[PDB]
Amino acid sequence: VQFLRTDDEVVLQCSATVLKEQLKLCLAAEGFGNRLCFLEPTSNAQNVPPDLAICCFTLEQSLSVRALQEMLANGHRTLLYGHAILLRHAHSRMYLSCLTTSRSMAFDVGLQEDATGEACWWTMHPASKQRSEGEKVRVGDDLILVSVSSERYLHLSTASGELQVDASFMQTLWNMNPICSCCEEGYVTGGHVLRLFHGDECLTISAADSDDQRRLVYYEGGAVCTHARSLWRLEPLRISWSGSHLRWGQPLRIRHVTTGRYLALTEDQGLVVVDACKAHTKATSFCFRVSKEKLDVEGMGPPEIKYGESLCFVQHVASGLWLTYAAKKKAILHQEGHMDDALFLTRCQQEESQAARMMHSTAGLYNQFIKGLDSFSGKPRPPPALPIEAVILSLQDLIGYFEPPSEELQHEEKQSKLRSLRNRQSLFQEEGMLSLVLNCIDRLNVYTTAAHFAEYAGEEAAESWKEIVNLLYELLASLIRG
């Protein structure tokens, strides 16, 4: 594609010079637990895969000044310079916006729950005389993005040492690189969260707190087919057009969603799942093959692999080894494999997909909090700063996430919303969310009062002690409620 249309998935990219070299950074936010945007390095993708899932936005709308201002009193259209755009985060379903807070004493840029104000609208402007107002925005174009609410530039900040995003009066050139646009119905694209079925049996890692360390891969049947631990994100070795149609033989990384780890071949362990910082191309590159015989684009490309209907052998690219079972059976990489090695893929729906990523971030955050709690116990203090603010917001968000529907609503909708809530509760429960909440409750209850906590933690950290235990108990209730 040459032009950006509405309903396209894009990433906002900028550049920085770090140690005499260009570093490409994408705009990222988690949403839940943390609204603030940050920058995800994408340059070192060959060695360390970037956390791309939270970098994706969709172009919801592109309005003229008159259309925007007029609609504020209350299909795939091309982007034109001078248009105001609405960017919806794919994961959190929140909207990229200019926030009313600041970290510098400029404005913070983050995610907003609702696209209701001026704050979630951004006008696009030409970076040179090569483009003009009312002209189509082209793929590859450098853009200036102006906050409609504050009249400020989407800015890359370099103070101090760290690379950050804010809304500043200084300008920054941005590229809206397309991830995907207009997919063929029923076809596998990159960035899709899915399950790999065998023959029923699906590919997975073990349950939380297993003696596995959650690092081995298995073919497992029964209930695991509906649990988060069997979900994987397909990640092509590219950033632009990463959401393009997946092709036979095309190399890709296979990411485990709840754990954030990468299917890999290792020298000593063989087929395992590996940390991002050890997920280099050779160890971590796989492709789908039509058969076991010998054997780039700037668009969606040709649609090749169908959901459910396509049978795919998985092959490790660098080694040529086939994804197979040892003979719940363990997954291995073998020179020959087995005649029934072919897998079919099934797309994960967004409720489950979102839940799985939510658990990933929740686990990461609460384990960080637990590790900080363990570090100063019992070491009376100058106290390894605790993520208080994020823990609070994470808790508050998860509580609203698990909130039962209002009894005032009708019967038909009530039963439908209940069925979703239970399913959401189930996914978290099966991923060891209860233990996680309990471990925070238990480690905090080691202290009698806030002042007792203040003896080991910060006096300032203690100001939130009661609120956190209260919220943790509240979440516990919300997780258990039927």
UniProtKB/Swiss-Prot annotation:
Detected in skeletal muscle (at protein level). Fast- or slow-twitch skeletal muscle. The N-terminus is blocked. It is found in: Sarcoplasmic reticulum membrane. Residues 76-127, 134-179, 185-237, 243-300, 302-349 form the MIR domain. Changing R138C: Decreases threshold for channel activation by K(+), caffeine and 4-chloro-m-cresol. Decreases inhibition by Mg(2+). The calcium release channel activity resides in the C-terminal region while the remaining part of the protein constitutes the 'foot' structure spanning the junctional gap between the sarcoplasmic reticulum (SR) and the T-tubule. Pore opening is mediated via the cytoplasmic calcium-binding domains that mediate a small rotation of the channel-forming transmembrane regions that then leads to channel opening. Belongs to the ryanodine receptor (TC 1.A.3.1) family. RYR1 subfamily. Homotetramer. Can also form heterotetramers with RYR2. Identified in a complex composed of RYR1, PDE4D, PKA, FKBP1A and protein phosphatase 1 (PP1). Repeated very high-level exercise decreases interaction with PDE4D and protein phosphatase 1 (PP1). Interacts with CALM; CALM with bound calcium inhibits the RYR1 channel activity. Interacts with S100A1. Interacts with FKBP1A; this stabilizes the closed conformation of the channel. Interacts with CACNA1S; interaction with CACNA1S is important for activation of the RYR1 channel. Interacts with CACNB1. Binding of [3H]ryanodine indicates that the heterozygous channel is activated by Ca(2+) concentrations 4-fold lower than normal. Single-cell analysis of cotransfected cells shows a significantly increased resting cytoplasmic Ca(2+) level and a significantly reduced luminal Ca(2+) level. Cytosolic calcium-activated calcium channel that mediates the release of Ca(2+) from the sarcoplasmic reticulum into the cytosol and thereby plays a key role in triggering muscle contraction following depolarization of T-tubules. Repeated very high-level exercise increases the open probability of the channel and leads to Ca(2+) leaking into the cytoplasm. Can also mediate the release of Ca(2+) from intracellular stores in neurons, and may thereby promote prolonged Ca(2+) signaling in the brain. Required for normal embryonic development of muscle fibers and skeletal muscle. This is Ryanodine receptor 1. The lineage of its organism: Eukaryota, Metazoa, Chordata, Craniata, Vertebrata. The gene is RYR1.
